[PDB]
Every structure is written in structure tokens, then in C-alpha cells.
Amino acid sequence: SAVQQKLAALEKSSGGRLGVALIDTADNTQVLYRGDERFPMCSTSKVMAAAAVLKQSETQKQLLNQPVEIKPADLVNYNPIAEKHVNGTMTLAELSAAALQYSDNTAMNKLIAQLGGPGGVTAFARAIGDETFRLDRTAPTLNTAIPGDPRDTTTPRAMAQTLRQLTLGHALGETQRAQLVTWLKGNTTGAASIRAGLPTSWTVGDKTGSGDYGTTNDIAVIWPQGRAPLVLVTYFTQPQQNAESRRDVLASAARIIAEG
Ligand SMILES: *C(=O)[C@@H](NC(=O)[C@H](N)c1ccccc1)[C@@H]1N[C@@H](C(=O)O)C(C)(C)S1
């Protein structure tokens, strides 16, 4: 197509490896660029963890109100919210909000522990039909993003298909799906990524990701006004370990997609 040429041109101008997957839910067509290649998810895998706890809430009705201790030894590299409740407690609802809207790594590790380890997160992915998603490590070592390392990776095709079933499909209950949609719309970390390349009248819920080798990710569900919703995944990684983040590439990919 024409989007393929411009995405390939954007990737050439960036010096890195770009992966894009779009699903238009009006006709279920797919716009893929390197859609079957493996990319490090970094903190875009947090959506899987929050959705798995939400799935647990379908049986444990009062699970999200359960308090969880935040002790100093739980602190890691980036804890913007959990820093404020040390020697106190946060409920699983506020931990999911801290993980999704502020990318709190301590909040993520608390979701992983609630699920019985990273194997419990991958289990939820297989239970909803995702055979590519694999979580192998806790935060922050899941952000190492070594080239060729299969740990903590997924493909754009699989992540877009899964994100649709969670936010638009019916892998979750209504209260759970609406709670996940509300969380993603309140994200505070994606102003410079997918959101920066979309028409400002479009409402977006998204989750960003960052890691070593300049890894810059963003997955998003997009509601255009007067049009069926869309799902967009943008993965980007770079050859140099000390590479700087490239959120501008994610915006440019979204603009190329939105024009399509
Ligand atoms: C996952 O994406 C997380 N990233 C990390 O833990 C990295 N070790 C890191 C990268 C850059 C600065 C500090 C730590 C969290 N999610 C990122 C994001 O959404 O962009 C993050 C920078 C907020 S940290």
C-alpha cells in the first residue's frame, strides 16, 4: 500500500526498527508493518497485568478494594505513586491506576505478585487467545530490551488483537472492560507518542513503554468521532544500548496511519 512506503521511509529516517499494527473495527482490516516480528514490550505489558487482575475481579467481586502493603523493599527504579504510600497500603485499584496511568513499576510488581508471578500474567494471555505474549521477568529488569532476546516480547499483530479483545471485545466483564477503558483514557505518559500524531478531536486511551536500546513503545485504542473505533500498536527499538527515547517516531507513525 501507500502507508507501507511511508512507514518504511519513517523507519529508514530513524535508524531503528519500527513495528506497527492497526486494526479498524469497521471492517476488521489490518495495517501491519513488521507485524510478526518480536519487539520488547517494556511497560506496555502492564495492560496485560491489570487486565488479568480485572479478570480475577470477575469472581472476587471486592478484589479491587483489597489493601496491599507498600514496604521500602518493594521500591525499584521508578515508583512515582508507590513512593507516596511507603509504610502504608494501596488497594489493587490504585495499584492498577498507578501502573497504567503513571507507569509505576512497584505497582506492576504488585499486580504480578497478585497473579502468582510473571507466569500468571502470561497465563491470562493464553487464556484469551494470545500465543505470542510472554512475560518472563518483573520490573525493572523486563525493560532490558536486548536485541534478539525473546524474553518479555510480543509482536505488533498479537498485541493489537489482544488489546481489542480487552477494551472493545469481551475478554473481560462489562464493569471490568469499562474500568480498563477509563484507566487507559486517564494515561499521563503518552502526550508525545501516539496522541501527538492524531487529530485532537479523537479520544485515545493508551499505554507507553520505555527501555534500554532506546526502546519506545505505545499501544492505543482510538475512538474517532462518528466512526468505528481503532486499535494502534507502535513499537520502536534502536541498535545502541544507550540510545535516547524516540517518542517522535511513534507520533509520526500514528500520523501516517491516521492519514490512511
Ligand atoms: C516501562 O516502560 C518502564 N520503563 C523503565 O522501567 C525503564 N527502566 C526506564 C526508562 C526511562 C526512564 C526510566 C526508566 C516505565 N514506563 C516508561 C514509559 O512509559 O515511558 C517510563 C519512562 C515512564 S518508566
Automatic annotation (TrEMBL):
<keyword id="KW-0614">Plasmid</keyword>
<keyword id="KW-0378">Hydrolase</keyword>
<keyword id="KW-0046">Antibiotic resistance</keyword>
<dbReference type="InterPro" id="IPR023650">
    <property type="entry name" value="Beta-lactam_class-A_AS"/>
</dbReference>
<dbReference type="InterPro" id="IPR000871">
    <property type="entry name" value="Beta-lactam_class-A"/>
</dbReference>
<keyword id="KW-0732">Signal</keyword>
<dbReference type="InterPro" id="IPR012338">
    <property type="entry name" value="Beta-lactam/transpept-like"/>
</dbReference>
<keyword id="KW-1015">Disulfide bond</keyword>
<dbReference type="GO" id="GO:0008800">
    <property type="term" value="F:beta-lactamase activity"/>
</dbReference>
<dbReference type="InterPro" id="IPR045155">
    <property type="entry name" value="Beta-lactam_cat"/>
</dbReference>
<feature type="domain" description="Beta-lactamase class A catalytic">
    <location>
        <begin position="19"/>
        <end position="234"/>
    </location>
</feature>
<dbReference type="GO" id="GO:0046677">
    <property type="term" value="P:response to antibiotic"/>
</dbReference>
<dbReference type="InterPro" id="IPR058131">
    <property type="entry name" value="Cefotaximase"/>
</dbReference>
<dbReference type="GO" id="GO:0030655">
    <property type="term" value="P:beta-lactam antibiotic catabolic process"/>
</dbReference>
<comment type="similarity">
    <text>Belongs to the class-A beta-lactamase family.</text>
</comment>
<protein>
    <recommendedName>
        <fullName>Beta-lactamase</fullName>
        <ecNumber>3.5.2.6</ecNumber>
    </recommendedName>
</protein>
<dbReference type="Pfam" id="PF13354">
    <property type="entry name" value="Beta-lactamase2"/>
</dbReference>
